[PDB]
Amino acid sequence: GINKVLDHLAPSELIKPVKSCHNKPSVLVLDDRIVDAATKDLYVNG
Amino acid sequence: FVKPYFQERKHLVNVLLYAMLDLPEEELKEKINFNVDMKALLSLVDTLHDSDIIRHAMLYEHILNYYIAWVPKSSYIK
């Protein structure tokens, strides 16, 4: 039990799939000239 | 310890560089007035020419295998 919980706190081989992150900062678009379901979720006034 | 004795002898530079370039005996005999042993010349030539003297899983293993696997008057000693 002690070992299995430590594996849960510290999953060594379980987590890392490929280690291939792009590492670029994602940019959010705030423009209100295009109508989309995702934009309507974040933009309220219409 | 040995170099001053080499500088003592005078023809050493000529014969050695000629040994370096493997010059034919005919050119040697043209301007050198002392006999040079041919079988020595071939032997030194032979000694001179002696020349017996997946991509992401490997990074995790090699970073462990290369950085965790602890390996336990100028240089002039080339």
Added chain:
Amino acid sequence: AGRILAMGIRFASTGNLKIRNILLSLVDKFLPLYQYPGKQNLDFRLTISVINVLTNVIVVSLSMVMCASGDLEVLRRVKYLHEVASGPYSDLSDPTAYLEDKKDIDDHYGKFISTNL
């Protein structure tokens, strides 16, 4: 981190085997997760930053308890955390990018002081 740090300081320079083995198992488990920005998620990013802090504590404490011994495996692991920047770059608006680079460069500085100590 708090418990092991008190554990390491308690057995400071006295040397032992059971504590060393336990710390060896802990560092072995927590080493692969170290500095792994796989899914760039701040909940994940804050958690793994604590992982970086935690793995800095384990290596320091492991060095604490085995002090002045010249241990092999302890040296073997701290050599690992010493080398390879890892992080976002390599493999595993101007002031803003300056601050964005400032955070990563400061993270590497903190990761180095622990392994150096």
